[PDB]
Ligand SMILES: *[C@@H]1O[C@H](CO)[C@@H](O[C@@H]2O[C@H](CO)[C@@H](O[C@@H]3O[C@H](CO)[C@@H](O)[C@H](O)[C@@H]3O)[C@H](O)[C@H]2NC(C)=O)[C@H](O)[C@H]1NC(C)=O
């Protein structure tokens with residue numbers, strides 16, 4: 001519980017690690033790793049309303065959580081070059097299990113107004129969707 | 133002896149880090165090395181230099197030429213057609229060179245030190261393996277933190293071809309020895325590999341002691357009837 | 364061309380496994396034809412038989428001679444001087460080769476595959492490493508269970524020297540790719556290294572699954588009515 | 595008396611059980627094997643002779659014996675034994691510790707604690 005490696009908010013998974021310089025045998029020590037999963041019991045499969053029933057199966061691949069594909073900057077000789085950081089990021093397309101506090105999620109519903117119909121837009125998470 | 137003609141590709145260290153992709157054309161097997169001919173097909177900055185006719189196997193003179201240029205017409209797929217129409221033969225001969233197609237891109241892997249080097253507390257070894265690339269050219273550098281180490285601190289082998297799973301691909305390795313104390317203090321190291329088939333021309337892997345195979349694992353699964361927002 | 368004579372130490376594959384200790388005093392580059400004779404300083408009980416000359420660069424030849432002394436007084440401390448004789452530049456050449464001193468032992472490491480390769484269900488790769496040995500002569504073989512794999516299934520590099528503090532030492536690597544079902548079933552593999560400064564002349568290492576497996580795993584299922592996480 | 599190696603219990607053909615007797619002063623000692631509580635004919639196992647064990651100060655002796663038995667019988671749970679007989683013992687008695695049989699721990703905690711996280 002000391003250094004954060006992964007803090008993922010599409011799946012709501014968090015991985016930390018710490019070198020525990022243990023008491024007995026004081027010239028060797030362990031490496032501990034903590035994983036925390038929070039499982040929502042009322043979310044759907046796709047995040048729209050009538051999709052499919054509530055999700056009952058949750059799968060986590062640690063090779064995908066630890067992935068790193070955004071380009072970085074490296075000073076080699078007296079230069080700045082751009083490099084990648086992973087072997088597998090041939091492509092959003094991932095499925096999310098929870099929401100995220102900092103993003104809107106909307107929908108579209110047709111309702112009637114006497115004559116024709118409209119394409120009324122509906123906020124699914126009302127705190128994060130004010131225009132500001 | 134017997135005359136021959138050759139054309140070699142530009143070196144990868146000046147094509148990727150810089151862009152000055154000079155070419156070279158070489159004829160060997162002459163003893164009157166003043167009367168010679170070189171002609172490329174494009175020559176706009178046509179000052180193709182020639183050098184001193186250095187020796188060869190058992191003291192035969194050898195002439196060569198360099199046509200300067202940079203890396204936009206090479207990587208776009210042009211062609212160069214050096215030819216020797218010297219008067220030491222009564223018939224000329226020709227060769228050409230083009231950027232190689234049918235490429236593959238490598239897979240880079242960094243490996244942590246073995247377990248039985250950590251007992252001695254003297255020095256530990258880090259191995260870098262790059263596999264499966266179709267041309268025979270590659271670059272390997274090392275970094276500590278964000279500082280590049282000088283080239284006299286690690287050993288890099290050569291690039292060889294591996295047992296055939298259908299098509300011909302290559303491999304290369306490299307090792308580096310660092311102090312055993314500052315690996316445990318928490319420094320980070322990186323192996324950087326450059327090859328002309330990668331999209332951003334470079335790729336990097338970074339390893340340290342905390343991002344390794346753990347001894348203890350703690351898993352806690354919490355079930356949240358409340359909300360699905362993940363604060 | 365210029366005439367020169369050198370002689371070579373016997374091969375390590377014939378000196379550790381087989382029984383074919385052969386020293387080869389040979390001169391290549393001969394202005395005359397095949398008219399040469401060689402005498403050696405020991406007279407152990409065998410005639411240094413010869414072979415016919417060969418084809419070389421532009422008129423030069425290559426004669427040779429093998430001393431058949433495959434009884435090994437080589438590792439006891441002999442000195443084994445050769446001596447040339449030919450209708451050539453009339454000063455008979457001599458050369459001297461002996462077993463080396465100041466020997467060190469190699470240190471052998473066998474590394475597990477990277478986890479990224481493991482999570483893809485294809486071939487997985489293993490790495491052998493030996494470093495710190497004093498003469499640049501070594502043999503690397505592989506095994507699966509007890510069967511030796513044929514040497515067309517794996518790639519091994521040359522033996523180069525490493526940057527260090529005074530005492531010159533050398534290193535070598537090798538790889539081998541196996542199928543994921545053989546790894547996941549529980550079949551073991553081995554890397555085996557032969558050197559002259561090892562007292563029993565060979566070393567083994569072995570690897571499979573459950574090598575860096577963890578020792579403790581805690582699972583906690585926190586039910587509802589207790590959700591108390593923090594930011 | 596020692597458990598079998600794991601790799602001989604992967605081909606499931608035959609297993610080996612090794613009885614080691616160590617550190618006794620006179621150099622004369624019997625070894626007899628028995629299946630369950632019935633003995634075996636002595637043409638079904640191999641036993642060595644005794645040798646001077648290397649030791650600091652005072653001298654001892656050691657002896658060894660083995661038995662190859664069917665793998666499925668050991669997978670079932672039949673019991674094997676070893677009877678080491680001697681003159682400097684109370685009654686020359688046996689030792690029978692081998693059969694076919696990780697540490698798991700299951701806990702329930704209320705944990706209405708003071709204040710914590712997860
Ligand atoms: C999960 O659900 C969302 C929400 O329903 C899906 O996205 C939506 O998919 C529909 C059908 O593909 C899109 O409708 C299209 O609208 C355009 C006009 O903009 C029209 O040209 C098409 O004929 C069609 O009517 C819609 O745009 C799209 N996006 C939204 C609502 O933002 C999504 O595909 C679902 N994903 C999975 C994996 O099930």
Ligand SMILES: *[C@@H]1O[C@H](CO)[C@@H](O)[C@H](O)[C@H]1NC(C)=O
Pocket residue numbers: 227228
């Ligand atoms: C390049 O050389 C090859 C043979 O060396 C031959 O096809 C021709 O001379 C050149 N190719 C083209 C397309 O001009």
Ligand SMILES: *[C@@H]1O[C@H](CO)[C@@H](O)[C@H](O)[C@H]1NC(C)=O
Pocket residue numbers: 442444458459460
């Ligand atoms: C051994 O080799 C050295 C180096 O050339 C030489 O000086 C010496 O005379 C040789 N000794 C014998 C016995 O050949």
